[PDB]
Amino acid sequence: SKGEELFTGVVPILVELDGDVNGHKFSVSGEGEGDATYGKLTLKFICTTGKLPVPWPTLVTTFVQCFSRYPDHMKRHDFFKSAMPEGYVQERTISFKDDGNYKTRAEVKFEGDTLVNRIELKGIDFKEDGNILGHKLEYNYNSHNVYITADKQKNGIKANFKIRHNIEDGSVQLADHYQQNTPIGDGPVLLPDNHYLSIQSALSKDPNEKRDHMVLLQFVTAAGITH
Ligand SMILES: [Mg+2]
Ligand SMILES: [Mg+2]
């Protein structure tokens, strides 16, 4: 299909986020590339307003599931690529257990040959010395499954999954994710059977980078449907 073909090679990615968490306003710009043939993403994010007022790991899911590797036998379930190039809206509520929540609204679409993720993020109800505003989360990331289901009335998909952020004391900060995606354009989109995405993520630092930043290497594979 038209959308699938846009992802057979390496695609440059841009990410732009504006955020307000408990009145702390910040912006992040990211760049990298995705190779959906291998489910592979490489991204570097820079906080352009100074120090990021929340922990970098809490923004990983917000900062392009069109780069998931869908096995050939699962291609009819790939909503994300099917919406391209016009793209999709991706909305989430991320609920940090016993703490605040993020509400995010993003548009993921091509600008020319570049896949862009533009995000507005609003965070409220955070505790001043909770794990988020208190920067008590380790700089690392766990592997997760994301269960995707069709959202037919929206001509899109939804998902609900749990992200676990490691706390510096050895505990875990749960971040419940609820997600809804809607296509922007008028092309035919794929409405999938229930399936999951399996995600692994590695966070690192650029040793030569003095701005506040995050380097992310991620692999995403669709699964849950046998051939
Ligand atoms: Mg810039
Ligand atoms: Mg631990």
Residue numbers in the entry: 2 to 64, 68 to 231
Paper text:
Isoleucine is very similar to valine in structure and properties, and it has been reported that the A state is selectively stabilized both in the T203V and T203I variants. The yield of purified sample of the T203I/E222Q variant was 4 mg per liter of culture, one-fifth less than that of the T203V/E222Q variant. The peak wavelengths of the UV–Vis absorption spectrum at pH 7.4 are almost identical to those of the T203V/E222Q variant, indicating that the I state is also stabilized in the T203I/E222Q variant. The crystal structure of the T203I/E222Q variant was determined at 1.48 Å resolution. The distance between Nδ1 of His148 and Oη of the chromophore is 2.85 Å. Ile203 take a conformation similar to Val203 in the T203V/E222Q variant, and the interaction manner with the chromophore is also similar with the T203V/E222Q variant. Gln222 also take the same conformation as that in the variant. For the distance between Nδ1 of His148 and Oη of the chromophore, average-strength hydrogen bonds were observed in the T203V/E222Q and T203I/E222Q variants. On a plot for the two structural parameters, the three states appear in different regions. In other words, structures spectroscopically suggested to be in the I state (T203V/E222Q and T203I/E222Q) is positioned in the low right area in the plot, while those to be in the A (T203V/E222Q at pH 5.0, T203V, T203I and wild-type GFP) and B (S65T and E222Q) states are in the middle-high right and low left areas, respectively.
Green fluorescent protein (GFP), discovered from Aequorea victoria, emits green light after absorption of blue light. GFP has a β-barrel fold, and the chromophore is formed at the center from the three amino acid residues Ser65, Tyr66 and Gly675,6. The protonation state of the chromophore differs between the two states, A and B. The phenolic group in the chromophore is protonated and neutral in the A state, while it is deprotonated and negatively charged in the B state. Spectroscopic measurements of the photoreaction of the A-type chromophore revealed the presence of the excited state proton transfer (ESPT) reaction, and a photoreaction model was proposed that includes the intermediate (I) state in addition to the A and B states.
